[PDB]
Amino acid sequence: HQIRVGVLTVSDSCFRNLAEDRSGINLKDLVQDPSLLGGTISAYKIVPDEIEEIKETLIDWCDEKELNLILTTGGTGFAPRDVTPEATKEVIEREAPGMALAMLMGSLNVTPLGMLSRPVCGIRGKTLIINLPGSKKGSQECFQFILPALPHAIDLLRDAIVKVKEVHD
Amino acid sequence: HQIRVGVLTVSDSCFRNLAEDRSGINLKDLVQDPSLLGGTISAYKIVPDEIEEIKETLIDWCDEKELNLILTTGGTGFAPRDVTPEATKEVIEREAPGMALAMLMGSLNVTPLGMLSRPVCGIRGKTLIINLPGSKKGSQECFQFILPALPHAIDLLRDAIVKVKEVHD
Amino acid sequence: HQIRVGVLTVSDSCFRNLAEDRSGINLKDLVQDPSLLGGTISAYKIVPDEIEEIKETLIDWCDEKELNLILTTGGTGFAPRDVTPEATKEVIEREAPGMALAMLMGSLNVTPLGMLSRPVCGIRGKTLIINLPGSKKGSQECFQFILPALPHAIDLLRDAIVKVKEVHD
Numbered sequence: 379h380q381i382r383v384g385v386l387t388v389s390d391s392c393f394r395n396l397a398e399d400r401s402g403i404n405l406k407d408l409v410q411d412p413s414l415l416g417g418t419i420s421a422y423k424i425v426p427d428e429i430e431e432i433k434e435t436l437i438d439w440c441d442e443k444e445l446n447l448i449l450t451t452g453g454t455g456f457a458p459r460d461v462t463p464e465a466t467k468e469v470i471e472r473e474a475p476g477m478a479l480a481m482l483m484g485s486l487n488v489t490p491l492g493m494l495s496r497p498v499c500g501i502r503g504k505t506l507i508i509n510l511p512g513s514k515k516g517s518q519e520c521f522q523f524i525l526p527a528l529p530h531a532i533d534l535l536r537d538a539i540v541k542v543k544e545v546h547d
Numbered sequence: 548h549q550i551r552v553g554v555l556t557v558s559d560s561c562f563r564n565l566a567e568d569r570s571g572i573n574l575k576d577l578v579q580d581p582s583l584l585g586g587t588i589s590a591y592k593i594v595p596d597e598i599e600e601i602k603e604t605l606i607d608w609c610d611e612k613e614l615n616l617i618l619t620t621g622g623t624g625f626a627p628r629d630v631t632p633e634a635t636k637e638v639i640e641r642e643a644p645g646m647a648l649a650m651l652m653g654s655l656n657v658t659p660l661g662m663l664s665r666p667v668c669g670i671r672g673k674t675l676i677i678n679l680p681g682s683k684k685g686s687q688e689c690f691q692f693i694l695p696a697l698p699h700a701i702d703l704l705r706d707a708i709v710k711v712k713e714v715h716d
Numbered sequence: 717h718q719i720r721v722g723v724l725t726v727s728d729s730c731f732r733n734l735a736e737d738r739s740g741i742n743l744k745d746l747v748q749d750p751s752l753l754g755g756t757i758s759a760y761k762i763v764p765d766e767i768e769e770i771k772e773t774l775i776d777w778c779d780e781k782e783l784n785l786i787l788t789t790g791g792t793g794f795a796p797r798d799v800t801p802e803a804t805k806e807v808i809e810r811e812a813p814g815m816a817l818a819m820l821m822g823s824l825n826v827t828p829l830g831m832l833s834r835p836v837c838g839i840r841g842k843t844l845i846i847n848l849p850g851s852k853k854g855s856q857e858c859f860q861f862i863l864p865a866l867p868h869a870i871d872l873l874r875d876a877i878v879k880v881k882e883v884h885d
C-alpha cells in the first residue's frame with residue numbers, strides 16, 4: 379500500500395545554489411502528510427533546465443527505482459530554457475491528459491496566467507509522472523487539484539511491467 | 548444522409564465472455580434513438596485490450612466501411628493494458644482536442660476520477676473517432692457531452708477523401 | 717519592446733478573392749488597439765488551405781522575421797481541407813496547451829460547437845503561434861479569451877534564440 383514518490387526540482391537557480399528549493403521542500407511535506415497522500419519520499423534531486431538531464435533522471439526513477447509517482451517542479455513555463463514537458467513527452471508511454479486538464483482549469487480559476495504553464499502528465503511502467511509549476515504556490519495548488527485522484531491512479535499502475543526489465547525476464 | 552456508426556468495445560473481460568457488454572449494447576441503443584443521434588449501427592465488435600487489433604479494426608472501419616462515426620468504449624484508463632488512446636493516435640489524420648476536452652470537463656463535473664480517463668478524439672477520412680470510457684455510466688455520460696456537436700461534425704466530413712483509396716482512383 | 721505581430725489568414729475563399737478577409741482585417745485592428753495588445757502589424761498574408769504553404773510561411777515569420785506573435789485565422793475546423801493545426805504542430809518547438817485549452821473552454825461557454833475547433837498553440841524561438849477560428853466572431857472571441865496572458869508570454873520569449881540562426885553564429 380506504500381506510495382514511493384520522487385520529487386524532481388528543475389531549476390537553474392536552485393541547481394546553482396542561488397535560491398532555496400521552497401517548492402520541492404514543500405512538496406516533500408505535502409506528499410508525506412498522512413492527511414494528504416501519506417506517501418514516502420524515495421527520491422529527490424535538483425537538476426538544471428536541460429532536457430537530457432531531466433530525461434535521464436525520469437528514466438532512472440521509473441525503470442530502476444520503480445517509483446509509483448514522480449512530481450516535477452519547474453521548467454514548464456514559457457522561458458526559453460523551460461523544457462520539462464518536452465523531456466516528459468520523450469519518456470512517457472501513455473499520456474494522461476485529464477490530469478493536465480484538471481490542473482489547468484484549477485489554475486485558470488486562480489489567474490489567466492495559468493495558461494502560461496505547459497505541463498504534461500503521463501505514465502511509464504508503474505510510474506505516474508506529473509509536471510507541476512516552479513513556484514511553491516503553484517506547485518501546491520496543482521498538487522491539491524489532483525490529490526483526490528492520486529491513490530486510485532497509483533493503485534491501477536502497481537502491477538504494471540517495467541518494459542526494459544521484462545525483456546530479460 | 549444516414550449516419551453510419553461503428554461501436555468498438557475494447558475489453559478483455561467481454562472478449563473472454565466473462566461479462567456482458569453493457570456499455571457497447573447501450574451505446575448501440577443511444578446511437579439509434581431517433582430523439583438522440585438517429586444513427587444506424589453499421590459495425591459492432593468486441594476486441595481484447597491489444598493495440599494492433601484495435602488499430603486494425605479502426606483502419607478497416609474508416610477505410611473499407613467508410614463509417615461516419617466510431618465510438619470506442621473501454622481501454623482508456625490507467626490499467627496497464629489500456630491502450631485504446633495509443634491505438635487511436637496511430638490511426639487518426641487530424642486530432643479533435645475540443646471533443647476530448649468537452650468530455651473531460653463534463654466528467655470532472657461528476658467526479659475528480661474523470662481525470663483518470665485518457666481519451667483521444669480525431670478524424671480519419673470521413674470518420675470521426677471518439678474514445679469513450681469502458682463503463683456504461685461513463686460512456687453514456689460522455690456520449691451526452693458531445694451529442695450536440697455530432698451531427699454537424701459528421702456533416703463536415705461526409706465528402707472527405709479516403710486516402711488509401713484515392714491513390715488508385 | 718514593441719510587439720511585432722503577424723496575421724496569417726488561411727482561407728481558400730479569401731485566397732481566391734471570393735470573400736473579404738473580415739477576420740484578418742479585424743484581428744489587425746484588435747492587435748493594434750493600445751487598450752488590448754498595443755501591437756504592431758509586421759506581417760500579413762492570405763494563403764490557401766494547404767499544409768506546405770502554411771508551414772513555409774510560419775517558418776519564415778518565426779525564423780527570418782523573428783515575430784513575437786503570430787495569429788493564424790482559419791483552417792482549424794473539421795472540413796477536410798482544414799490543416800492549420802497540423803501545419804502548426806510541424807513547426808513548433810514547445811507546445812502551449814494551456815492557451816489552446818483556454819480558448820476552447822471559453823468557446824464552449826458560448827456554444828457546444830466550440831468543440832469542432834481544433835487549435836494548436838505553441839512556441840518557436842521568440843514566436844508564440846496561436847491558431848484562431850476562421851470566422852470574425854470566433855477569432856475575436858478566441859483572441860479576447862487569451863489576451864490577458866499575451867503580454868507576459870511574449871516578454872518571456874523575447875530573448876529566445878532562433879535555432880537555425882544560432883548554429884552559424
Ligand code: NA
Ligand atoms: Na495533445
